[PDB]
Scaffold this active site. Structure first.
Site, mmCIF file in Angstrom:
data_model
loop_
_atom_site.group_PDB
_atom_site.id
_atom_site.type_symbol
_atom_site.label_atom_id
_atom_site.label_comp_id
_atom_site.label_asym_id
_atom_site.label_seq_id
_atom_site.Cartn_x
_atom_site.Cartn_y
_atom_site.Cartn_z
ATOM 1 N N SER A 1 0.791 -1.246 0.000
ATOM 2 C CA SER A 1 0.000 0.000 0.000
ATOM 3 C C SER A 1 0.832 1.311 0.000
ATOM 4 O O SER A 1 1.568 1.564 -0.949
ATOM 5 C CB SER A 1 -1.051 -0.028 1.120
ATOM 6 N N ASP B 1 -12.324 -5.166 5.435
ATOM 7 C CA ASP B 1 -11.614 -6.314 5.954
ATOM 8 C C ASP B 1 -10.273 -5.892 6.558
ATOM 9 O O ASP B 1 -9.488 -5.201 5.935
ATOM 10 C CB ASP B 1 -11.414 -7.368 4.868
HETATM 11 P P1 LIG Z 1 -2.854 1.796 1.915
HETATM 12 O O1 LIG Z 1 -2.002 2.114 3.065
HETATM 13 C C1 LIG Z 1 -3.526 3.261 1.093
HETATM 14 C C2 LIG Z 1 -4.149 4.259 2.064
HETATM 15 C C3 LIG Z 1 -4.838 5.309 1.206
HETATM 16 C C4 LIG Z 1 -5.499 6.462 1.964
HETATM 17 C C5 LIG Z 1 -5.874 7.485 0.899
HETATM 18 C C6 LIG Z 1 -6.787 8.607 1.335
HETATM 19 C C7 LIG Z 1 -7.598 9.100 0.392
HETATM 20 C C8 LIG Z 1 -8.576 10.228 0.635
HETATM 21 C C9 LIG Z 1 -9.045 10.706 -0.724
HETATM 22 C C10 LIG Z 1 -10.063 10.095 -1.334
HETATM 23 C C11 LIG Z 1 -10.504 10.554 -2.701
HETATM 24 C C12 LIG Z 1 -12.005 10.560 -2.851
HETATM 25 C C13 LIG Z 1 -12.594 9.775 -3.750
HETATM 26 C C14 LIG Z 1 -14.099 9.802 -3.881
HETATM 27 C C15 LIG Z 1 -14.785 9.019 -2.763
HETATM 28 C C16 LIG Z 1 -16.200 9.527 -2.500
HETATM 29 C C17 LIG Z 1 -17.125 9.255 -3.684
HETATM 30 C C18 LIG Z 1 -18.584 9.400 -3.288
HETATM 31 O O2 LIG Z 1 -4.064 0.826 2.290
HETATM 32 C C19 LIG Z 1 -4.255 0.401 3.628
#
Ligand SMILES: *[P@@](=O)(CCCCC/C=C/C/C=C/C/C=C/CCCCC)OC
Ligand SMILES: [Ba+2]
Ligand SMILES: [Ba+2]
Ligand SMILES: [Ba+2]
Length: 684
Positions: free
Chosen positions: A315, A523
């Site tokens: 990730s 999960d």
């Molecule tokens: P990895 O460690 C990855 C962890 C990722 C965290 C990322 C945070 C993202 C926030 C931004 C989100 C974008 C929005 C998208 C649209 C969603 C709403 C639509 C209705 O895994 C454990």
């Protein structure tokens, strides 16, 4: 590689059902049965449909060919037929036919509702089927149907291509791929359906069929069946690929060189004396990304990064990996360059990433992508936003391209681990694949279309942000606090007016082997693991693992998962039993070593903790009162800027975490050198 095994003939007769539910409005069922075998996709049998019965008696029989070396699951299900609407399932059962033995007739009742079935396995006198197997994955025998031309619809059920259709009338041809063990037919048409049978496991002949137009000049076809020409593009094996073995030689000599200086050694090390050292990293979004940069920095400054053969992450960790490996000499060049890059992009606000200028450019790229052969999923959108959050722009870099970074053994081999829908998929620049199944393809071909281990259509290798989205995917398979509830609307509204096969497609398993609509994945497995599976792939032989952990609660969870994971595969692995003291306030570095255990790798574990960085500005050096702030890193309580959601870090906050991480590894130099020395004798 190959295996010859004869199929058996299974006849299943569907007798009766009992106590079938009624449809609504006091309507008795009009039932029929459907039979499907998991190893014969696209092929269905259907009983006659009976009317107004809760106790239907069909007494119908059907015949399959069954390959006993493969796992075979019969799906049998009961539908209520409806002249106007789609039919409602009222009964479903999945039956493993391993139970059925040849000669012995076997009566089964599957269960208020019940279904009676008879099974009979009989020996046959076909040639044996030619399988290609791994002892876990099986490629069934494939034949190809070839059709020459001198509004044409050719249907061949059970084949990869289901139906095909040219419009022309001049020298066209077509190829159908399908299992040799199927009992099927080819159907042609321009009325009337001409059908030709395709018996299983038989040598094909030349066949000429004239197909009538309505009612004008007919069309002539030549048909012949043969074993498929193509070779397998998917590699089946539980050994390391040639390129990785070659790399290991290259890399081991720079590790030998690096070790001699680091350890101030007596003589040069021969290849078979070089201990294999791996980095293992957990997820944690931006927190993992930045903290890992801090860790690599420490390893560079101590001249120990050159001692590392393997670099694995999950990730957020892969974000650090993906960028660094964009540069083919990142480990030799100064890391403070890439740190600045990450910091600056992380401090940049993410309001514009959701501005309709960028949204336009995303959908306008999805449409371009969708015009090409590409299923469109949220993860592909996530790819674009993540690329925009991480860079200012499109980044034209590709996983296959990171081989450059390994040509001269100048960096460790990167292993990007992904948990899919659960199976572990390992990505490296030499190969991508399923650890469990031992099925791998080179990364160029990842995303391309496959059938039974064979490349059907080459799709161009995608931009690395699209693999990063796989690796860091956060989103629920069905989308259908106040901060990121508003970009949701902006995205939704902008995308209004708008199915994923992988490279195992067709392959099979060897025998002996009321409200919850969710926006994210939930999960625990998606957020709590580390990249151990890459460290324990059969051929790797790890001697020392540097385990970096980016959890804010539970610094030992991922190690305990790894203990389980190894325990369940009979792999030597030290036991992770930290004291209550170690749980409550862990320290910079924990050694887990079982000389009680034997060829188990040495394990140095680095929790994400403040501890002694509070009063030390650098390893050994006491903290001035003028740099008191410098050691106060907000790892707990509210307004902690390092939470998993957060993708904007003030440069100040970035620096505390980076420097803390750098410090935790640097201050552990002794333990690392100790473990390096130990990995030496243990290797020999
Ligand atoms: P990895 O460690 C990855 C962890 C990722 C965290 C990322 C945070 C993202 C926030 C931004 C989100 C974008 C929005 C998208 C649209 C969603 C709403 C639509 C209705 O895994 C454990
Ligand atoms: Ba009815
Ligand atoms: Ba219907
Ligand atoms: Ba031909």
């Amino acid at each position: 590689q190959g295996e010859a095994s004869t199929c058996w003939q299974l006849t299943v007769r569907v007798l009766e059902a009992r106590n079938l539910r009624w449809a609504d409005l006091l309507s008795e069922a009009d039932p029929y049965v459907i039979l499907q075998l998991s190893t014969a996709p696209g092929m269905k049998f259907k009983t006659k449909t009976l009317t107004d019965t809760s106790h239907p008696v069909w007494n119908e029989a059907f015949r399959f060919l069954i390959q006993s070396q493969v796992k075979n699951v019969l799906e049998l299900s009961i539908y209520d037929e409806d002249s106007v609407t789609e039919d409602d399932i009222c009964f479903k059962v999945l039956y493993d036919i391993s139970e059925v033995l040849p000669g012995k007739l076997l009566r089964k009742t599957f269960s208020e509702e019940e279904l009676d079935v008879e099974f009979l396995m009989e020996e046959t006198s076909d040639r044996p089927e030619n399988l290609i197997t791994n002892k876990v994955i099986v490629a069934r025998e494939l034949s190809c149907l070839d059709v020459h031309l001198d509004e044409l619809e050719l249907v061949l059920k059970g084949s990869y291509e289901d139906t095909q259709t040219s419009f022309l009338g001049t020298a066209s041809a077509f190829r159908f791929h399908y299992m040799a063990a199927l009992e099927t037919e080819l159907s042609g048409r321009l009325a009337g359906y001409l059908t030709v049978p395709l018996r299983p496991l038989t040598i094909g002949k030349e066949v000429t069929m004239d197909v009538p137009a309505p009612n004008a000049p007919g069309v002539r076809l030549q048909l012949k069946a043969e074993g498929c020409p193509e070779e397998l593009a998917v590699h089946l094996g539980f050994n390391l690929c040639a390129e990785e073995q070659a790399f290991l030689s290259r890399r081991k000599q720079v590790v030998a060189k690096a070790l001699k200086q680091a350890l101030q050694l007596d003589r040069d090390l021969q290849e078979d004396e070089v201990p294999v050292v791996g980095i293992m990293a957990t997820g944690g979004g931006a927190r993992a990304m930045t903290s890992l940069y801090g860790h690599l920095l420490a390893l560079q400054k101590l001249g120990l990064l050159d001692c590392v053969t393997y670099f694995s992450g999950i990730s957020g960790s892969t974000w650090t990996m993906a960028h660094l490996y964009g540069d083919p000499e990142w480990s030799q060049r100064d890391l403070e360059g890439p740190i600045r890059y990450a910091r600056e992009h992380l401090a940049k606000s993410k309001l514009e990433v959701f501005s309709p200028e960028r949204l336009a450019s995303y959908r306008r790229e999805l449409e371009l992508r969708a015009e090409q052969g590409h299923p469109t999923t949220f993860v592909d959108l996530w790819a674009l936003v993540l690329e925009s959050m991480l860079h200012g722009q499109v980044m034209d870099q590709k996983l296959s391209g990171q081989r450059a970074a390994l040509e001269r053994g100048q960096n460790p081999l990167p292993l990007y681990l992904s948990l899919n829908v659960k199976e572990w998929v390992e990505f490296s620049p030499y190969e991508v694949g399923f650890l469990k199944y031992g099925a791998f393809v080179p990364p160029e071909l990842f995303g391309s279309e496959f059938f039974m281990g064979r490349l059907m259509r080459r799709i161009p290798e995608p931009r690395i942000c699209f693999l990063e989205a796989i690796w860091s995917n956060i989103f629920s398979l069905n989308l259908l606090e106040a901060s990121w509830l508003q970009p949701g609307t902006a995205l939704a509204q902008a995308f209004k007016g708008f199915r994923s096969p992988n490279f195992l497609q067709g392959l099979q398993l060897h025998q002996d082997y009321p409200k919850e609509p969710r926006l994210c994945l939930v999960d625990a497995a998606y957020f709590i693991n580390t990249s151990s599976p890459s460290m324990f792939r059969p051929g790797r032989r790890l001697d020392l693992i540097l385990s970096f952990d980016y959890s804010l609660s539970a610094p030992f969870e991922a190690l305990q998962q790894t203990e389980l994971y190894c325990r369940a595969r009979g792999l030597p692995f030290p036991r992770v039993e930290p004291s209550p003291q170690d749980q409550h306030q862990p320290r910079e570095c924990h050694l887990f070593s079982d000389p009680a255990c034997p060829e188990a790798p040495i394990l140095l574990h680095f929790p994400l903790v403040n501890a002694s960085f509070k009063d030390h500005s650098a390893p050994g050096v006491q903290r001035s009162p003028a740099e008191l702030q410098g050691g106060q890193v907000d790892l707990t309580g509210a307004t902690c800027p390092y939470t998993l959601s957060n993708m904007t870090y003030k440069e100040e906050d970035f620096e505390r975490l980076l420097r803390l991480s750098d410090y935790n590894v640097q201050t552990s130099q002794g333990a690392i050198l100790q473990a390096l020395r130990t990995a030496l004798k243990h290797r020999t």
